[PDB]
Amino acid sequence: QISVRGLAGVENVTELKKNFNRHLHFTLVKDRNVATPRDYYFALAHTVRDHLVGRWIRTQQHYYEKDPKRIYYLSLEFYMGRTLQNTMVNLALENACDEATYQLGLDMEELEEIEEDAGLGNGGLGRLAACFLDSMATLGLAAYGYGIRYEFGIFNQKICGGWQMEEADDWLRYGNPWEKARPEFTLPVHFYGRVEHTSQGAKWVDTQVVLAMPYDTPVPGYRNNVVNTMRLWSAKAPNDFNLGYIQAVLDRNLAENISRVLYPNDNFFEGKELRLKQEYFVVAATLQDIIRRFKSSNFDAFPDKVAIQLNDTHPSLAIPELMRVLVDLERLDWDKAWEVTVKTCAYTNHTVLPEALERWPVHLLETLLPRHLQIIYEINQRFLNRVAAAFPGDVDRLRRMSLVEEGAVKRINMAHLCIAGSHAVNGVARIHSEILKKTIFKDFYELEPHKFQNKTNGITPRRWLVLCNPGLAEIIAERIGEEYISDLDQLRKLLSYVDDEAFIRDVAKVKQENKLKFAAYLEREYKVHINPNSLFDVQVKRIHEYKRQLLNCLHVITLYNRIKKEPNKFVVPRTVMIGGKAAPGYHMAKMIIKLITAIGDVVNHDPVVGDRLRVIFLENYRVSLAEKVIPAADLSEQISTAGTEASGTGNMKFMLNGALTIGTMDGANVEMAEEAGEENFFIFGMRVEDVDRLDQRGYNAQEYYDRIPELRQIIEQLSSGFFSPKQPDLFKDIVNMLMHHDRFKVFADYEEYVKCQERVSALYKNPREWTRMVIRNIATSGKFSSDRTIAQYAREIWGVEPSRQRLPA
Ligand SMILES: O=C(/C=C/c1ccc(O)c(O)c1)O[C@@H]1C[C@](O)(C(=O)O)C[C@H](O)[C@@H]1O
Ligand SMILES: *Cc1c(COP(=O)(O)O)cnc(C)c1O
């Protein structure tokens, strides 16, 4: 029906129909009379997968024959979402599959909704890994994503009586048609044991063995016939494990628990043994695979054929594991092995919050990984000898830079290990990378300035425009053609349409159509009744104090109080939508969800407010829900305290999809404003330097309460039970934190936020000028393609040239 979805040729549709029927009969063992909607989805998925396999086999052969440098992207999280539609998009099959399914009496969009998200990540870090795989394949790089096949991904969120409840995400229950088990590449991973020194060096002995079984998933590039691999490891017990008899067999579960569940902690490090086991498991299995593939081409060439990218410190044990293999097993001298290791590894940092840094207790590493601890101590001693020679007498610098932190419990600082053992260290937006050089890693920058880089984050325009917003993709394609989908800078050409009355109308119509469709989805799945003429004000992301959902809540209560004070005054109607998951042990984040729902309970049932203000908590925010809500948004809330959000990527998704942004000068917001023009962004609040100045004097929240009567009224409403009438003190923890212990200075940005929100409302009353500003944002969003990001990694870190040429079909 629309050009960006491809051709529906006669031969193609006919063939798709016959293969669909073949899978329904032979694969699923059903006839049309007893087939359930789930059967139809599986028949379709198997049909589409059949089109990947020839290209997958041919791509992997091509890499064997050409022998390029291989890129290994190591991550504990891959937040992939659904695969069916993405696969159709990248193989240009969407219109054909639509027509084929239509002709069988089926609605393809309905079948798409049956697929489970692959929710193998928490938020931004996991999704960046998924966007990166898509871009690496689209740029023709010989790239592999390596992680863990968690049996249970991020929990499904239910809201009961306004409180978050967690339930298990049993995403594999019905099977996964995209993965291929590769039991023949099963490898042993070792734990515990002890170290014996011999004439022939050290030996790690008396270990427990767990098997790592790989499952491969295809990663198709955009219309270029490249299909790369994501390899995920699953834990299996050996067959003699513990071998009364019954209990020995049941105890196999202890080994297999390694790959059972994703830790749901976004930004709060816990030193749990099971998590450490996951980290080593993924590293040890992956490195054996890497070395195997390298041997089937002398270790001096290893960094010419291999790059390893560490997605945060979670796979940081790759550094001492590579040293262990090179020294203990291959018998390279230390200095040679270290040179190879450093030249092979690179590290990406994703946060500056100190509570998110991995600092493992020494006693844990000593029991679990005794040889690795010895290697780490040796790395540290040699590293500090270099620091001492560069900065003689600077004894305090030696303690600050050490990998080993002294204290009540000794710990290993994993970030310090990653810097020491990597040839490149990068942050994820310009301001963040600057902050790394000036503050937390200043000592390391002074020692080795050349290591430190920036690579500003991006998002894939396949998932985040073509897939989720085909209406927008099409009206763009009508004027500038299709090339922009793999070269997003071509969106700049849209600036010449900013005064085009037809283009203005089309852009605004697409937003309206997306809003209507989203409003309908709300009514159907969640019984909720919104006004699609209102401004859609959305904040979706994980719930954390630094992201300041609480600041949004204060604004919502302010509008409510203004309405109550002057009920017969006109106000621009809003639907305020907030969604996101809280980590199960994070009490304050759970209290914030309850506050949002309790505000909703008052505001949504006040007859004086009417349809002028609605507050909705979007349950179970995940990749598939992001694809629905983001195209429907008018206003994107990106309101973290300056200095706390390393980059953000939700921000970029909203910009691409025709929302305007209200935000602080934080993370990538800075670069987004710079690209669009500050006049086309709603910027407010303290800059990083203002936060610094306040810290030096001391933040006193009382001063703001004392000086702003509107803020004082809200705090008194919260305290006295206005929003919790049956439990008057329900929110006293929230009040106490804001008044006495707020690390993120919510009150300090309140006045400027409210004023800036009044300017947003003023512009929304003038649809033509609203839409013109939107066009200026979409037109300048090209920098934020993950294709640009990956090209920079490839050239500046990995030493490989991207390619846009097709492989033969
Ligand atoms: O998602 C994470 C961290 C996850 C994490 C930390 C510690 C753990 O122990 C853990 O299990 C997870 O950071 C993201 C990264 C980001 O989306 C990006 O570059 O992609 C940029 C954002 O600003 C955001 O802060
Ligand atoms: C993009 C995305 C995120 C990251 O959003 P931020 O606003 O950058 O934290 C988190 N969760 C999901 C499901 C996403 O798609």
Side-chain angles (χ1 to χ4, degrees), residues 254-295:
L254 301 178
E256 300 176 350
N257 283 347
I258 290 163
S259 52
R260 197 79 69 201
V261 60
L262 169 74
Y263 272 77
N265 305 122
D266 222 46
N267 271 254
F268 196 92
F269 169 76
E270 287 166 11
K272 293 296 170 52
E273 195 192 30
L274 188 62
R275 170 65 176 201
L276 184 59
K277 283 176 171 188
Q278 289 181 337
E279 292 181 351
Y280 183 59
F281 178 75
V282 64
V283 157
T286 299
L287 272 171
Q288 287 175 80
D289 224 21
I290 285 169
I291 290 167
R292 181 189 51 73
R293 201 175 283 115
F294 175 72
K295 281 176 166 183

Tab-separated table of all heavy atoms in Angstrom, residues 254-295:
chain	number	residue	atom	x	y	z
A	254	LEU	N	21.449	-26.118	39.832
A	254	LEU	CA	22.363	-25.154	40.402
A	254	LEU	C	23.297	-24.588	39.326
A	254	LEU	O	23.500	-23.385	39.294
A	254	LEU	CB	23.182	-25.751	41.557
A	254	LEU	CG	22.402	-26.314	42.754
A	254	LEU	CD1	23.375	-26.897	43.767
A	254	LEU	CD2	21.508	-25.253	43.376
A	255	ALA	N	23.829	-25.451	38.447
A	255	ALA	CA	24.720	-25.013	37.354
A	255	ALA	C	23.963	-24.224	36.294
A	255	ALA	O	24.442	-23.194	35.756
A	255	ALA	CB	25.405	-26.224	36.722
A	256	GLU	N	22.753	-24.676	36.005
A	256	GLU	CA	21.961	-24.091	34.920
A	256	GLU	C	21.330	-22.766	35.340
A	256	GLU	O	20.972	-21.960	34.486
A	256	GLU	CB	20.963	-25.142	34.374
A	256	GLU	CG	21.760	-26.349	33.856
A	256	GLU	CD	20.954	-27.541	33.356
A	256	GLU	OE1	19.717	-27.588	33.552
A	256	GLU	OE2	21.618	-28.454	32.794
A	257	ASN	N	21.292	-22.482	36.647
A	257	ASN	CA	20.843	-21.153	37.116
A	257	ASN	C	21.645	-19.962	36.633
A	257	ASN	O	21.133	-18.820	36.673
A	257	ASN	CB	20.757	-21.101	38.619
A	257	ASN	CG	19.526	-21.797	39.161
A	257	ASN	OD1	18.573	-22.147	38.443
A	257	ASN	ND2	19.549	-22.009	40.446
A	258	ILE	N	22.851	-20.201	36.128
A	258	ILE	CA	23.698	-19.123	35.612
A	258	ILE	C	22.986	-18.323	34.528
A	258	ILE	O	23.078	-17.096	34.505
A	258	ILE	CB	25.075	-19.657	35.127
A	258	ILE	CG1	25.897	-20.101	36.339
A	258	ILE	CG2	25.878	-18.589	34.378
A	258	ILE	CD1	27.076	-20.992	36.017
A	259	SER	N	22.263	-18.997	33.628
A	259	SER	CA	21.619	-18.291	32.537
A	259	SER	C	20.115	-18.134	32.731
A	259	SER	O	19.418	-17.873	31.765
A	259	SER	CB	21.963	-18.967	31.187
A	259	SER	OG	21.682	-20.343	31.231
A	260	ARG	N	19.618	-18.253	33.968
A	260	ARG	CA	18.185	-18.287	34.215
A	260	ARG	C	17.537	-16.915	34.113
A	260	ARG	O	16.472	-16.812	33.543
A	260	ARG	CB	17.875	-18.907	35.577
A	260	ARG	CG	16.441	-19.369	35.800
A	260	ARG	CD	16.159	-20.714	35.149
A	260	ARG	NE	16.872	-21.765	35.846
A	260	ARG	CZ	17.181	-22.964	35.355
A	260	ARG	NH1	16.829	-23.326	34.126
A	260	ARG	NH2	17.860	-23.818	36.122
A	261	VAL	N	18.168	-15.860	34.629
A	261	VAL	CA	17.450	-14.613	34.775
A	261	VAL	C	18.352	-13.373	34.700
A	261	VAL	O	19.453	-13.362	35.246
A	261	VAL	CB	16.604	-14.643	36.071
A	261	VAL	CG1	17.482	-14.826	37.296
A	261	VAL	CG2	15.708	-13.405	36.187
A	262	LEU	N	17.845	-12.354	34.008
A	262	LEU	CA	18.472	-11.038	33.893
A	262	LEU	C	18.358	-10.303	35.227
A	262	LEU	O	17.274	-10.238	35.815
A	262	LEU	CB	17.808	-10.219	32.758
A	262	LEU	CG	18.162	-8.720	32.675
A	262	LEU	CD1	19.558	-8.508	32.129
A	262	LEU	CD2	17.148	-7.993	31.806
A	263	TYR	N	19.486	-9.822	35.755
A	263	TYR	CA	19.429	-8.968	36.926
A	263	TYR	C	18.727	-7.653	36.523
A	263	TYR	O	19.135	-7.032	35.571
A	263	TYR	CB	20.806	-8.672	37.492
A	263	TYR	CG	21.198	-9.705	38.462
A	263	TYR	CD1	21.645	-10.950	38.025
A	263	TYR	CD2	21.090	-9.468	39.831
A	263	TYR	CE1	22.014	-11.934	38.937
A	263	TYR	CE2	21.445	-10.443	40.753
A	263	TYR	CZ	21.907	-11.673	40.293
A	263	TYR	OH	22.251	-12.634	41.201
A	264	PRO	N	17.670	-7.263	37.242
A	264	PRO	CA	16.883	-6.084	36.862
A	264	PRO	C	17.364	-4.706	37.400
A	264	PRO	O	16.606	-3.733	37.311
A	264	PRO	CB	15.501	-6.448	37.380
A	264	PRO	CG	15.785	-7.190	38.627
A	264	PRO	CD	17.038	-7.985	38.358
A	265	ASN	N	18.606	-4.627	37.875
A	265	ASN	CA	19.235	-3.387	38.403
A	265	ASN	C	19.896	-2.484	37.356
A	265	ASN	O	21.024	-2.718	36.929
A	265	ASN	CB	20.357	-3.703	39.395
A	265	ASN	CG	19.920	-4.574	40.516
A	265	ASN	OD1	20.484	-5.650	40.721
A	265	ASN	ND2	18.915	-4.127	41.261
A	266	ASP	N	19.188	-1.429	37.010
A	266	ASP	CA	19.645	-0.305	36.197
A	266	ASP	C	20.365	0.585	37.300
A	266	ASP	O	19.811	0.818	38.373
A	266	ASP	CB	18.354	0.393	35.622
A	266	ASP	CG	18.436	0.814	34.140
A	266	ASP	OD1	18.886	0.065	33.241
A	266	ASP	OD2	17.998	1.936	33.834
A	267	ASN	N	21.602	1.022	37.080
A	267	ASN	CA	22.296	1.969	38.025
A	267	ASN	C	22.303	1.702	39.612
A	267	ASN	O	22.291	2.651	40.410
A	267	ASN	CB	21.819	3.426	37.707
A	267	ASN	CG	22.677	4.141	36.638
A	267	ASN	OD1	23.469	5.028	36.975
A	267	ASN	ND2	22.502	3.784	35.352
A	268	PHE	N	22.346	0.446	40.082
A	268	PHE	CA	22.732	0.164	41.507
A	268	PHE	C	23.510	-1.153	41.730
A	268	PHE	O	22.909	-2.221	41.899
A	268	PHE	CB	21.554	0.228	42.483
A	268	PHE	CG	21.987	0.334	43.936
A	268	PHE	CD1	22.144	1.584	44.540
A	268	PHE	CD2	22.274	-0.811	44.699
A	268	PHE	CE1	22.561	1.697	45.870
A	268	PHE	CE2	22.695	-0.703	46.023
A	268	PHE	CZ	22.840	0.553	46.611
A	269	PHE	N	24.841	-1.067	41.786
A	269	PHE	CA	25.678	-2.275	41.843
A	269	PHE	C	25.462	-3.078	43.148
A	269	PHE	O	25.547	-2.541	44.266
A	269	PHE	CB	27.171	-1.923	41.635
A	269	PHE	CG	28.134	-3.070	41.930
A	269	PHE	CD1	28.285	-4.118	41.044
A	269	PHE	CD2	28.870	-3.087	43.099
A	269	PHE	CE1	29.175	-5.173	41.321
A	269	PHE	CE2	29.743	-4.117	43.378
A	269	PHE	CZ	29.906	-5.153	42.476
A	270	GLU	N	25.179	-4.370	42.980
A	270	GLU	CA	25.166	-5.343	44.067
A	270	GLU	C	26.211	-6.420	43.752
A	270	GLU	O	26.199	-7.003	42.673
A	270	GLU	CB	23.786	-6.003	44.128
A	270	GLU	CG	22.676	-5.115	44.666
A	270	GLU	CD	21.274	-5.656	44.400
A	270	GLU	OE1	21.117	-6.829	43.979
A	270	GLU	OE2	20.312	-4.890	44.610
A	271	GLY	N	27.076	-6.708	44.703
A	271	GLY	CA	28.079	-7.754	44.572
A	271	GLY	C	27.522	-9.126	44.888
A	271	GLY	O	27.843	-9.721	45.901
A	272	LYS	N	26.691	-9.628	43.991
A	272	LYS	CA	26.101	-10.949	44.132
A	272	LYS	C	26.904	-11.980	43.339
A	272	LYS	O	27.261	-11.754	42.181
A	272	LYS	CB	24.647	-10.897	43.660
A	272	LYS	CG	23.732	-10.039	44.553
A	272	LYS	CD	23.611	-10.620	45.960
A	272	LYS	CE	22.926	-9.686	46.948
A	272	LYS	NZ	21.616	-9.188	46.455
A	273	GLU	N	27.158	-13.126	43.961
A	273	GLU	CA	27.961	-14.159	43.350
A	273	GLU	C	27.367	-14.647	42.037
A	273	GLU	O	28.105	-14.891	41.080
A	273	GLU	CB	28.116	-15.341	44.305
A	273	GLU	CG	29.230	-16.280	43.875
A	273	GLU	CD	29.234	-17.597	44.611
A	273	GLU	OE1	28.160	-18.077	45.031
A	273	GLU	OE2	30.334	-18.160	44.730
A	274	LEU	N	26.050	-14.812	41.983
A	274	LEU	CA	25.435	-15.283	40.751
A	274	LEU	C	25.726	-14.325	39.559
A	274	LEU	O	26.003	-14.790	38.449
A	274	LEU	CB	23.933	-15.527	40.948
A	274	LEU	CG	23.160	-16.203	39.788
A	274	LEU	CD1	23.699	-17.592	39.512
A	274	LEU	CD2	21.657	-16.271	40.062
A	275	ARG	N	25.680	-13.013	39.799
A	275	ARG	CA	25.964	-12.041	38.750
A	275	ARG	C	27.421	-12.134	38.293
A	275	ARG	O	27.706	-12.031	37.096
A	275	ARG	CB	25.629	-10.647	39.265
A	275	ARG	CG	26.076	-9.495	38.409
A	275	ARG	CD	25.367	-9.471	37.070
A	275	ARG	NE	25.782	-8.278	36.328
A	275	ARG	CZ	25.126	-7.700	35.315
A	275	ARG	NH1	23.988	-8.197	34.869
A	275	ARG	NH2	25.624	-6.606	34.749
A	276	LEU	N	28.343	-12.365	39.233
A	276	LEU	CA	29.745	-12.530	38.877
A	276	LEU	C	29.941	-13.771	38.022
A	276	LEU	O	30.742	-13.760	37.075
A	276	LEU	CB	30.655	-12.611	40.129
A	276	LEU	CG	32.179	-12.682	39.907
A	276	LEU	CD1	32.742	-11.495	39.137
A	276	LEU	CD2	32.904	-12.834	41.220
A	277	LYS	N	29.223	-14.839	38.359
A	277	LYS	CA	29.237	-16.060	37.557
A	277	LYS	C	28.751	-15.812	36.133
A	277	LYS	O	29.348	-16.300	35.188
A	277	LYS	CB	28.391	-17.150	38.223
A	277	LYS	CG	29.098	-17.785	39.391
A	277	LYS	CD	28.164	-18.795	40.064
A	277	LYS	CE	28.893	-19.608	41.078
A	277	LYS	NZ	27.987	-20.690	41.562
A	278	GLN	N	27.682	-15.033	35.982
A	278	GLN	CA	27.182	-14.658	34.645
A	278	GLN	C	28.226	-13.910	33.835
A	278	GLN	O	28.413	-14.213	32.661
A	278	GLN	CB	25.917	-13.791	34.750
A	278	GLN	CG	24.712	-14.572	35.224
A	278	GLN	CD	23.481	-13.712	35.307
A	278	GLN	OE1	23.578	-12.498	35.427
A	278	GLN	NE2	22.321	-14.334	35.248
A	279	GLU	N	28.898	-12.958	34.480
A	279	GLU	CA	29.920	-12.160	33.825
A	279	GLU	C	31.108	-13.007	33.337
A	279	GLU	O	31.580	-12.821	32.215
A	279	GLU	CB	30.385	-11.005	34.736
A	279	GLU	CG	29.305	-9.949	34.946
A	279	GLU	CD	29.729	-8.763	35.814
A	279	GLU	OE1	30.810	-8.788	36.417
A	279	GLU	OE2	28.952	-7.787	35.881
A	280	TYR	N	31.563	-13.957	34.143
A	280	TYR	CA	32.685	-14.776	33.741
A	280	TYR	C	32.261	-15.759	32.624
A	280	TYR	O	33.016	-16.008	31.675
A	280	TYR	CB	33.326	-15.524	34.911
A	280	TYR	CG	34.530	-16.311	34.436
A	280	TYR	CD1	35.606	-15.664	33.822
A	280	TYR	CD2	34.583	-17.687	34.539
A	280	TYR	CE1	36.693	-16.365	33.352
A	280	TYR	CE2	35.677	-18.394	34.094
A	280	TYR	CZ	36.727	-17.735	33.492
A	280	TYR	OH	37.808	-18.438	33.002
A	281	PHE	N	31.065	-16.318	32.781
A	281	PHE	CA	30.508	-17.311	31.878
A	281	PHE	C	30.506	-16.781	30.460
A	281	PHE	O	30.971	-17.435	29.530
A	281	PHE	CB	29.099	-17.632	32.335
A	281	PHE	CG	28.361	-18.615	31.480
A	281	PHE	CD1	28.656	-19.954	31.541
A	281	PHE	CD2	27.289	-18.198	30.683
A	281	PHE	CE1	27.929	-20.883	30.783
A	281	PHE	CE2	26.554	-19.122	29.925
A	281	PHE	CZ	26.884	-20.463	29.979
A	282	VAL	N	29.972	-15.589	30.308
A	282	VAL	CA	29.897	-14.994	29.010
A	282	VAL	C	31.283	-14.694	28.424
A	282	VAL	O	31.510	-14.957	27.235
A	282	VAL	CB	28.921	-13.789	28.955
A	282	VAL	CG1	29.370	-12.647	29.837
A	282	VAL	CG2	28.774	-13.318	27.523
A	283	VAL	N	32.194	-14.201	29.261
A	283	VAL	CA	33.552	-13.888	28.835
A	283	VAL	C	34.345	-15.142	28.451
A	283	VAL	O	35.014	-15.144	27.406
A	283	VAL	CB	34.252	-13.095	29.954
A	283	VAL	CG1	35.754	-13.179	29.891
A	283	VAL	CG2	33.766	-11.666	29.936
A	284	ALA	N	34.279	-16.191	29.276
A	284	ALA	CA	35.100	-17.387	29.072
A	284	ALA	C	34.675	-18.158	27.851
A	284	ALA	O	35.515	-18.575	27.059
A	284	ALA	CB	35.061	-18.291	30.292
A	285	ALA	N	33.370	-18.340	27.689
A	285	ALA	CA	32.840	-18.999	26.494
A	285	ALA	C	33.188	-18.217	25.209
A	285	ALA	O	33.722	-18.785	24.254
A	285	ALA	CB	31.338	-19.184	26.620
A	286	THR	N	32.912	-16.921	25.217
A	286	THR	CA	33.160	-16.045	24.065
A	286	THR	C	34.636	-16.041	23.616
A	286	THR	O	34.943	-16.173	22.415
A	286	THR	CB	32.669	-14.620	24.360
A	286	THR	OG1	31.263	-14.645	24.605
A	286	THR	CG2	32.949	-13.678	23.161
A	287	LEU	N	35.553	-15.897	24.569
A	287	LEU	CA	36.995	-15.869	24.248
A	287	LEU	C	37.512	-17.143	23.626
A	287	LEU	O	38.362	-17.078	22.709
A	287	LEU	CB	37.867	-15.442	25.445
A	287	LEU	CG	38.045	-13.919	25.545
A	287	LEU	CD1	38.718	-13.493	26.836
A	287	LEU	CD2	38.891	-13.420	24.378
A	288	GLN	N	37.017	-18.303	24.082
A	288	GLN	CA	37.394	-19.562	23.443
A	288	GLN	C	36.946	-19.618	21.978
A	288	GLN	O	37.662	-20.109	21.106
A	288	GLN	CB	36.786	-20.773	24.173
A	288	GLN	CG	37.409	-21.110	25.518
A	288	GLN	CD	36.651	-22.243	26.215
A	288	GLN	OE1	36.847	-23.419	25.892
A	288	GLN	NE2	35.724	-21.887	27.114
A	289	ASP	N	35.734	-19.140	21.734
A	289	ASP	CA	35.176	-19.065	20.385
A	289	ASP	C	36.017	-18.155	19.504
A	289	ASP	O	36.324	-18.498	18.357
A	289	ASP	CB	33.740	-18.530	20.475
A	289	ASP	CG	32.764	-19.280	19.621
A	289	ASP	OD1	33.027	-20.436	19.250
A	289	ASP	OD2	31.701	-18.694	19.342
A	290	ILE	N	36.402	-17.003	20.052
A	290	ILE	CA	37.242	-16.015	19.349
A	290	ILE	C	38.585	-16.628	18.937
A	290	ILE	O	39.003	-16.513	17.774
A	290	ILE	CB	37.476	-14.729	20.205
A	290	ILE	CG1	36.221	-13.856	20.219
A	290	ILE	CG2	38.638	-13.889	19.675
A	290	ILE	CD1	36.254	-12.712	21.229
A	291	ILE	N	39.251	-17.272	19.896
A	291	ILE	CA	40.551	-17.843	19.641
A	291	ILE	C	40.409	-19.005	18.663
A	291	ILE	O	41.229	-19.133	17.770
A	291	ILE	CB	41.267	-18.202	20.962
A	291	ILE	CG1	41.663	-16.886	21.662
A	291	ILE	CG2	42.492	-19.079	20.730
A	291	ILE	CD1	42.092	-17.042	23.096
A	292	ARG	N	39.361	-19.815	18.803
A	292	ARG	CA	39.116	-20.909	17.852
A	292	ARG	C	39.060	-20.400	16.415
A	292	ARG	O	39.782	-20.902	15.559
A	292	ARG	CB	37.831	-21.667	18.171
A	292	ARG	CG	37.545	-22.844	17.218
A	292	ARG	CD	36.152	-23.435	17.422
A	292	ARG	NE	35.092	-22.416	17.404
A	292	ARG	CZ	34.648	-21.778	16.316
A	292	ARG	NH1	35.154	-22.022	15.111
A	292	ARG	NH2	33.677	-20.880	16.431
A	293	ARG	N	38.190	-19.420	16.184
A	293	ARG	CA	37.967	-18.819	14.879
A	293	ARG	C	39.240	-18.169	14.331
A	293	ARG	O	39.497	-18.265	13.130
A	293	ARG	CB	36.826	-17.787	14.971
A	293	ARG	CG	36.162	-17.463	13.646
A	293	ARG	CD	34.966	-16.518	13.817
A	293	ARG	NE	33.759	-17.190	14.336
A	293	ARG	CZ	33.160	-16.972	15.512
A	293	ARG	NH1	33.619	-16.094	16.399
A	293	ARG	NH2	32.084	-17.685	15.825
A	294	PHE	N	40.019	-17.510	15.207
A	294	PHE	CA	41.344	-16.964	14.858
A	294	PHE	C	42.362	-18.039	14.422
A	294	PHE	O	43.159	-17.789	13.521
A	294	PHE	CB	41.957	-16.183	16.027
A	294	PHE	CG	43.379	-15.694	15.778
A	294	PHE	CD1	43.635	-14.649	14.882
A	294	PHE	CD2	44.452	-16.253	16.461
A	294	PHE	CE1	44.930	-14.193	14.663
A	294	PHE	CE2	45.750	-15.802	16.250
A	294	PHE	CZ	45.990	-14.777	15.342
A	295	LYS	N	42.382	-19.195	15.090
A	295	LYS	CA	43.349	-20.256	14.736
A	295	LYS	C	43.055	-20.911	13.383
A	295	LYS	O	43.968	-21.412	12.722
A	295	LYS	CB	43.447	-21.310	15.841
A	295	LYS	CG	44.312	-20.838	16.992
A	295	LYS	CD	44.333	-21.828	18.138
A	295	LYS	CE	45.461	-21.506	19.103
A	295	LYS	NZ	45.554	-22.512	20.193
